[PDB]
Amino acid sequence: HMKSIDEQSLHNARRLFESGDIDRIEVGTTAGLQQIHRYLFGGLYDFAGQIREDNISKGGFRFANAMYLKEALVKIEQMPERTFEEIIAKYVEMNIAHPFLEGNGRSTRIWLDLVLKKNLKKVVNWQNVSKTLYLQAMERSPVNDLRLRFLLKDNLTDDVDNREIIFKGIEQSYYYEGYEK
Amino acid sequence: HMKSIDEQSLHNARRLFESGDIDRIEVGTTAGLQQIHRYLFGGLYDFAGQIREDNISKGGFRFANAMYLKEALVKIEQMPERTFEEIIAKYVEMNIAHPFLEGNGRSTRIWLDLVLKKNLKKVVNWQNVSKTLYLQAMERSPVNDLRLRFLLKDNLTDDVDNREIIFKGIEQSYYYEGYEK
């Protein structure tokens, strides 16, 4: 049956890695996140790669106000990346920014892995990070990022070029957002 | 017994009105909010009137990141004030900003009343706004400000210079934050 947006986007994510285009993206910047988003969602959402102008929320949580989102992103992208703790803090702020109308979670997890890979030579082995534990750690993270830090730290891998880790991690990441083939 | 910080601050709030200094403050601006805060807390908190550099949270809610708080405040203070709906929206954003380490609620409710008074010739009759209903409306407000809008609209008064409304409203406002003589 015709591919859904999420299914085609998962194919786009796989291609991002298969083609090597993943490693030609800016790391740790707003523009690099936009690049990822455009690769994942170009042709699928008209706003692929575009910073939102509208406010968004999920549950009882409102993401950063569009009114000062661009200003926030400039500060976020200048945050340091030299330790695991710093990188998670930067990720937590980029999640709070949530700069697109859709596709924030999936694009920003790829973004995080590029920052980890560049600075620590590690990535998250997402296939081993449960959806329930991830989502609860993310919900806690604005106030206290310790649960998220430990969850991700416990699931780091140095096998950053392994196909199975990459592809199973894409699958897991998309499953966090509700998609399973 | 020696006055507490909250007790002396309540006296400062009363004096702000008794002296007429209330009506010599900028309305609807960050600087005007700082002015209120300095009047309420000067001599009590070393940070009276000062924009925080640290992050703060209450419950599972983190207020705007200090990292981009100044940038946020510039946008917030430029929000329009010509309708009740606009004024509540501006207030909701200033509450999310929560720009001081302490004293945000009390200072920002005075700030709100000055905006209402200037633009609508009304203020909130806080003595009639229950603490429980206020706090639940405020908790909902980042996502949906309708409950807050209706609660405050239902409690507006045109008797903006009435001593009892003013002084009982200060008392109620301080009680929202836990202080009762």
Ligand SMILES: [Cl-]
């Ligand atoms: Cl930090």
Ligand SMILES: [Cl-]
């Ligand atoms: Cl997503």
Ligand SMILES: [Cl-]
């Ligand atoms: Cl925020």
Ligand SMILES: [Cl-]
């Ligand atoms: Cl608005």
Ligand SMILES: [Cl-]
């Ligand atoms: Cl307060």
